[PDB]
Scaffold this motif. Sequence first.
Motif, PDB file in Angstrom:
ATOM      1  N   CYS C 354       1.029  -1.236   0.035  1.00 45.80           N
ATOM      2  CA  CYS C 354      -0.030  -0.010  -0.064  1.00 45.80           C
ATOM      3  C   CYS C 354       0.986   1.297  -0.077  1.00 45.80           C
ATOM      4  CB  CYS C 354      -0.820  -0.018   1.408  1.00 45.80           C
ATOM      5  SG  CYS C 354      -1.533  -1.600   1.794  1.00 45.80           S
ATOM      6  N   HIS C 355       0.454   1.973  -0.797  1.00 51.00           N
ATOM      7  CA  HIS C 355       1.239   3.401  -0.825  1.00 51.00           C
ATOM      8  C   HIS C 355       0.361   4.613  -0.494  1.00 51.00           C
ATOM      9  CE1 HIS C 355       4.880   1.710  -2.725  1.00 51.00           C
ATOM     10  NE2 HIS C 355       3.879   1.078  -3.326  1.00 51.00           N
ATOM     11  N   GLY C 356       0.198   4.829   0.798  1.00 49.11           N
ATOM     12  CA  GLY C 356      -0.939   5.869   1.250  1.00 49.11           C
ATOM     13  C   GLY C 356      -1.381   6.882   0.343  1.00 49.11           C
ATOM     14  N   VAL C 357      -2.532   7.109   0.064  1.00 52.32           N
ATOM     15  CA  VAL C 357      -2.702   8.271  -0.853  1.00 52.32           C
ATOM     16  C   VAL C 357      -3.139   9.592   0.391  1.00 52.32           C
ATOM     17  CG1 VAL C 357      -2.913   7.569  -3.062  1.00 52.32           C
ATOM     18  CG2 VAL C 357      -4.816   7.741  -1.638  1.00 52.32           C
ATOM     19  N   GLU C 358      -3.758  10.623  -0.438  1.00 52.24           N
ATOM     20  CA  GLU C 358      -4.084  11.665   0.524  1.00 52.24           C
ATOM     21  C   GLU C 358      -5.726  11.397   0.463  1.00 52.24           C
ATOM     22  OE1 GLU C 358      -2.621  15.278  -0.500  1.00 52.24           O
ATOM     23  OE2 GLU C 358      -3.517  16.164   1.313  1.00 52.24           O
ATOM     24  N   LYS C 359      -6.367  11.427  -0.738  1.00 48.78           N
ATOM     25  CA  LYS C 359      -7.377  11.360  -0.880  1.00 48.78           C
ATOM     26  C   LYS C 359      -8.001  10.116  -1.895  1.00 48.78           C
ATOM     27  CE  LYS C 359     -10.683  15.632  -1.591  1.00 48.78           C
ATOM     28  NZ  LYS C 359     -10.840  15.620  -0.212  1.00 48.78           N
ATOM     29  N   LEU C 360      -9.042   9.976  -1.433  1.00 43.50           N
ATOM     30  CA  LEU C 360      -9.726   8.830  -2.442  1.00 43.50           C
ATOM     31  C   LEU C 360     -11.053   9.364  -3.355  1.00 43.50           C
ATOM     32  CD1 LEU C 360     -10.323   5.419  -0.295  1.00 43.50           C
ATOM     33  CD2 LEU C 360      -8.531   6.028  -2.237  1.00 43.50           C
TER      34      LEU C 360
END
Lengths: 418, 418, 418, 418
Positions: C354-360
Amino acid sequence: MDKFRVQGPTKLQGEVTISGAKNAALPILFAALLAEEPVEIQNVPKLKDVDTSMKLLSQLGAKVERXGSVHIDARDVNVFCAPYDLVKTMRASIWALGPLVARFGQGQVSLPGGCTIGARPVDLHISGLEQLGATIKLEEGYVKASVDGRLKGAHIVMDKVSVGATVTIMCAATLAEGTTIIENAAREPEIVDTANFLITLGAKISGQGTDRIVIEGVERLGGGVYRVLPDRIETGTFLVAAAISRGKIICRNAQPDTLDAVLAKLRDAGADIEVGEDWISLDMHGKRPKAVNVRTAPHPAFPTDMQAQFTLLNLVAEGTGFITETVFENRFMHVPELSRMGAHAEIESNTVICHGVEKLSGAQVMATDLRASASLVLAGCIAEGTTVVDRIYHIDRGYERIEDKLRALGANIERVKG
Amino acid sequence: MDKFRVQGPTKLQGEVTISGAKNAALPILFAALLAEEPVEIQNVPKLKDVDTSMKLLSQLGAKVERXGSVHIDARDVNVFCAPYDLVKTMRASIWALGPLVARFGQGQVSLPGGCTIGARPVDLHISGLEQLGATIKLEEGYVKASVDGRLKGAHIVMDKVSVGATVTIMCAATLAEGTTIIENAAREPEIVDTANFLITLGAKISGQGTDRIVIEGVERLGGGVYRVLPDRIETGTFLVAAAISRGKIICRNAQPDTLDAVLAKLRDAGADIEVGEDWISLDMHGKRPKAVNVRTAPHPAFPTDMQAQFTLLNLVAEGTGFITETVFENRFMHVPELSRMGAHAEIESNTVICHGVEKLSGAQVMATDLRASASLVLAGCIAEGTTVVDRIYHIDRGYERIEDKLRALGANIERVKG
Amino acid sequence: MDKFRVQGPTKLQGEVTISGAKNAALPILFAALLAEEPVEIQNVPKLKDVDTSMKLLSQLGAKVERXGSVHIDARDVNVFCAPYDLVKTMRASIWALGPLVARFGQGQVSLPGGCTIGARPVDLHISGLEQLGATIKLEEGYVKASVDGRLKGAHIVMDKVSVGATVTIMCAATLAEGTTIIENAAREPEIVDTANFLITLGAKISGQGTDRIVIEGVERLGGGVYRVLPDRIETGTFLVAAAISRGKIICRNAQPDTLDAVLAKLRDAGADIEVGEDWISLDMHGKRPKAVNVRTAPHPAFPTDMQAQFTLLNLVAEGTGFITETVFENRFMHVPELSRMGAHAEIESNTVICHGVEKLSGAQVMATDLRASASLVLAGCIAEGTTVVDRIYHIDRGYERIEDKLRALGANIERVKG
Amino acid sequence: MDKFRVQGPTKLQGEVTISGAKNAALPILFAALLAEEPVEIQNVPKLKDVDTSMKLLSQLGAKVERXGSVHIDARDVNVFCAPYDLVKTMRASIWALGPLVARFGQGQVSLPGGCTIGARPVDLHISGLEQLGATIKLEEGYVKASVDGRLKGAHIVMDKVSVGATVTIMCAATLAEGTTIIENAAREPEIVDTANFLITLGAKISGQGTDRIVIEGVERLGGGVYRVLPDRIETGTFLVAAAISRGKIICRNAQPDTLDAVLAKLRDAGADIEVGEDWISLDMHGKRPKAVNVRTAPHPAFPTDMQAQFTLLNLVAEGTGFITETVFENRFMHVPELSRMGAHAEIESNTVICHGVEKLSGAQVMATDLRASASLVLAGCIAEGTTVVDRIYHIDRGYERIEDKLRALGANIERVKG
Ligand SMILES: [C]C(=O)[N][C]1[C](O=P([O])([O])OP([O])(=O)O[C][C]2O[C](N3[C]=[C]C(=O)[N]C3=O)[C]([O])[C]2[O])O[C]([C][O])[C]([O])[C]1O[C@@]([C])([C]([O])[C][O])C([O])=O
Ligand SMILES: [C]C(=O)[N][C]1[C](O=P([O])([O])OP([O])(=O)O[C][C]2O[C](N3[C]=[C]C(=O)[N]C3=O)[C]([O])[C]2[O])O[C]([C][O])[C]([O])[C]1O[C@@]([C])([C]([O])[C][O])C([O])=O
Ligand SMILES: [C]C(=O)[N][C]1[C](O=P([O])([O])OP([O])(=O)O[C][C]2O[C](N3[C]=[C]C(=O)[N]C3=O)[C]([O])[C]2[O])O[C]([C][O])[C]([O])[C]1O[C@@]([C])([C]([O])[C][O])C([O])=O
Ligand SMILES: [C]C(=O)[N][C]1[C](O=P([O])([O])OP([O])(=O)O[C][C]2O[C](N3[C]=[C]C(=O)[N]C3=O)[C]([O])[C]2[O])O[C]([C][O])[C]([O])[C]1O[C@@]([C])([C]([O])[C][O])C([O])=O
């Protein structure tokens, strides 16, 4: 075993002369068992594995001598068994089998162990020499192969991609009656080279370097002089050395076409790369490498044999890169050692997650296999302070005078007592 | 490099006395670094790794002697570095770290590099100690720990099951301020043994043998005498030895309730098993083992240290069975060596598919690690002809006089120098 | 089919009251087949799986009624088959087998076929009951088990940790003659609940929650009232909902001692967790979560049933995390759905990078299984814009009033028909 | 959705006429979006996925119709979005993206969509178009790709082998400015077919069928008439039908050279196989097949699209064999359904271990995907009793008239509501 004491940090710059591919020299040295007139193989690297192949050749009744050339007169091969004490040090000696069966109707070769990077069975070879007309038994640890006629051409579909087994079947199809087709054949450049060596003897081979190889048998094979192509792994090693030491190297006596994938990755890492006819140059222009993602696969894809190297590239690179290893099951032994030097890595299955750090710290580390060993010596070169790499015998198997060659790039390396 | 020349076939039968657990003796040896009064550890096997522990204990300034028993007096410990030369000969050395940190507020241990059987990182030891209030850095390949005064008890939920990390955290927690809870603790009998040894010194520990260990920190620990429990893996090794040889064996000084999974599988395999309070008998009634499916996992499931031995059982058993190794990623290095001996196995990832054969053949084989070495010796005993197992020094790490014990079961074994 | 239309981003705020465990209610409802006097099971969540269990019970001849509680009268059971038509909708119905066999000496259940999340064999159930003296064949796709007289207690060592197998063997063993010991039993809280339900009926069981359960068979079980423990997976889902929405939550009627690993991971992610006797609060303090490394394994470790949710957490977290699934092999079907919403994931073997994003971003996504559906709903809450989650019936299997509970936390969710 | 009722056991014998390949027809249909004059695709099978492609093409503003042939006039294509409501039912619509970007400067295609057999990201499709100059974002679950002017040819080295990403980049490159090189291109016969279709329209392509495709870009593609090659997977499927049922089949309108690996594995199983220019016969001569080991990999190795069927073959063969799946991470869902049928199978991550039985028994089973559905229908034919395969909608996607084709071989099959 002994050791290299490597003092870093050292920026690696200058030229190196690339040596003959170890992985072309070896199958060519055993394929020479097929020759009924003397062979001279040129551009052979002075490697332990070559010495062992030579002692094995002489053991079989070939006359062998060497200096860059190796001379092989296999006219009077009269012994058909490669003893355990040799095969135990060089699993590539399984290559003695196919030639001896195809020329002499018989061959016996100790079944290889037992390897650290993976288990490496030879089921495909000693299937292969079966789909040809060989009967094969195992007794007392010896693969015993016989044909009590002469070998017979077959349509062979390889159920795995294997460099080793493709060579075996190919070499031992040159003395078969009829056509041999090899489907899903390995296409590494060493196989192209071995094939072109075999044609120099007067073999009939089509499509080496492709996924299908065609061999029409011939009665016998002659002599000839053959120059082994440059080592693409050693080339990649010295290119990486410069990439991670923010340096600039020119590899001379090289074959850039063997290296599409690896050159693309060094560019992806931000190396400035030019390629001439027989040289590759690389300049980081003083710059830290950028992290790349890598995925090993059979030629022409990214080679497993550059994997340990590129792992280290990543661990000193900018950002995070992923190294996925698909060819060998246990080829990440460098990583815990790089870890001792301050590398931030994580192993998930056959993927190592590499968080690049600015500098490694010197530390005592343990080489585990050939390409690992060189990666550790490279790590030593760019680490702060003193690195001692133990079990350097591994390096001597596949690299000629790496200490010299690195020293001419500015490295501070001493081979030490043990 | 010493080797075993083993002669087969031979039926293994009779009686064997099980030595103390190597894997309880080792963690207790390092835990003795917590003791501020003399300590006697009884039933300690005479093994190489014990010797190494003793060297390192002495090098930290404990006074150390042995015959049955190892006597330790860590009162005057005054060196807090476990050096590379030691750790690299046994990674178990990482166990000095928690003791030194907990009792002295400082500790340095060489970061273990990689291992033949797997990467074996010590992240969980380090993070466990971090959670007890330690600061830890890696400088020059040394894992350096320190705390301001006392460690502080904490609720620790272990990310995965680790025997070694459970020991580290448990031993350190004994001198911390407050309560430590280790959730998802390893439940190995050797952890029960280590906790009970710590209790003998004056520690307050609860829940050992379960997934949740509760430690109440004390200011100080004293001395005492503790007898180490029987080696369950040695036990299983000899149980397998009778099973695969169609024999009968009694193990004295056993502890059956440590071997539930191994005895269930041996029963599955066709063994007639009986237990007493301190003994296990196996009788095959002259019959070949039936193949079994095995999946290694932390205690009380089938242990990974019996895996190589059962791979062997399966490779001479009737029918087909698989062994899946879920604990170590590269513990199938005995497999190609057994393949040389005529075994028919196929390694698909972390699974070995075994097709049992009636007879094995003697061959020169290479011991790579401890449990593999013993399986190779055991294969030697039942194969037809001569097996030479090289690099027997591996066996010497974890078996007390295995040659003398097998010889007493009817084995034909000679220790051979060159 | 019904869908949820979800509008975000929504900060999830307030409190929720935790329903009883789906996964204690289900095994208890089947165990009630042993009961020869009415039973009231209290705190049973209103869920499709419960309705299915009740349907199957009515079809075996139990009288079943429900509101808080489900009442069962199995005195009159007289049909002994769980037909395909119902097993196909809920594989937990394998749980009828053990009761029916143990009480009535016969039992037929359709062998569960494959499942979205893994193959899920029931080989451990069959072997457990065989070990109790049941004869079992498979005809026409039904597992048909039979005994002459009652079952017979046995020392059963479990190959793998199984929740479903442990329950099966434990319930059967209640009416067996003699003593049954289950080694390497699953330790899940729902196993404790099921044992304690059995004890209320007059069964003799100790060691539930530990790796060894011992059962003393009785002639006959009674009835009784028994309240099902809080759903730890529901609690975790709502804790994750708050954790990923910059929220604060309070779970009422919780049992925190079931969620040690989960609360520890939400701590590593930077959540402020407090516990009470029967409540858990989480507060992020305006904070987006932080990436973590999860490894699922049997209780008390991180539960596979929280994995999809935590994958979600990692994919919106600041940082790079790994989710590793050791329990179910294909339990990653949420990943490509979240990918549609903008998640940077990457599946590699049994781990998800997982490479966390800021927004979905909102998107039409499809629920594939229970925990996956919950994850997609929670994703919809924190996604910018409108998310439509199709095949929402999966959620209704295992969550009571999810939509009402989320709305009371400030989610904007609408259930849609077509 | 509807079901098949199969009454067995039936010895399948006779002839079958193989349909055009679903997996050439499909990329060919989307490649037709590049065409500026009408196209006729000949030998297109009548299958659900073709209908969906047709529906999608119509929506993009192509004029499309079918009977043997599908006609496409793409001259007036003017809608550049492949919407979720169509893409969700067919992954391969990802293929609309490349052509639309290549020809119109933009395309929008819903990102798939999560799949039972594995996660199936399209990251290589994206990254190949970005490498040809496109700018790609993802917005509300739609992959939105734009370029100003034409694409620009690029040397693209593909990190993994991907049929879909190979076709995406190859089609898009035909209208690119300058030269494009695909390294590590897939070699599947359908990639060759698509390339030859592209050439019929005036694209300049060489290397198709090899690991390196060179496309010299052109101004505009025209129209023409192109016949799709035979379905090697349909062919394989009926060859296995003949194999497992101890029957004899002749397949007409075949291309033997697309099936080297499958034919060799079928010989390994005891089949007597003969091939002509456009036919394959398989005759088992009343024999049960022998168990084989299979390793799936990209063409020319054993195809993953034959794995379920050969799993079935092993599960009724004599002996034990293993199927390893290297392409898709979760393609064993047929197995637990075959288990309901009395198959003896064991799954250990990416390998199924098969222990063939004499006869399967008819049972209600559920299809999970296309090749699985087909294998359960085959299992049906040879099982004893009555098999009802549910969710047969899977079969209709990739088989034309499999029920009529199987009946002509003597199968007793009825399509049913159930
Ligand atoms: C000497 C040389 O050449 N080497 C090399 C090669 O190797 P080999 O071994 O040949 O390989 P392969 O075969 O390809 O392998 C792959 C895979 O597969 C398998 N197999 C094989 C065979 C048979 O028979 N079977 C089977 O199964 C194995 O196991 C594997 O996994 O090649 C390689 C690749 O590239 C390389 O890497 C090598 O090289 C090295 C590694 C060696 O030498 C050692 O050292 C180096 O150099 O490093
Ligand atoms: C000395 C002793 O005791 N040993 C033993 C043990 O080991 P260890 O190391 O402790 O283990 P563990 O930890 O448990 O491990 C498991 C797993 O996990 C992992 N990890 C760990 C840690 C950390 O920190 N991290 C991680 O990750 C690893 O890798 C693995 O995988 O224990 C064991 C089990 O039971 C045994 O085996 C042992 O033993 C031996 C092997 C020795 O040698 C050494 O090891 C024998 O054989 O003896
Ligand atoms: C109803 C309930 O409770 N559920 C749950 C459970 O599940 P089960 O199925 O019971 O699981 P187990 O058993 O534990 O499993 C695990 C493993 O193992 C295997 N197996 C089993 C059995 C036998 O016999 N064999 C075998 O092999 C399988 O496959 C696997 O891998 O529990 C679980 C765990 O924790 C859970 O998750 C569950 O839950 C759920 C998933 C439901 O769905 C059910 O289905 C949720 O989500 O809720
Ligand atoms: C429609 C058609 O053609 N299909 C087919 C194909 O698929 P695809 O999808 O194209 O595949 P690929 O691509 O080759 O894949 C492989 C691998 O890789 C990976 N990837 C991909 C792409 C991207 O971008 N990324 C990645 O990662 C994946 O995931 C995998 O793993 O082809 C195939 C192979 O051969 C086949 O199978 C197919 O077919 C089928 C299955 C269909 O339906 C689906 O698609 C049949 O036919 O069955």
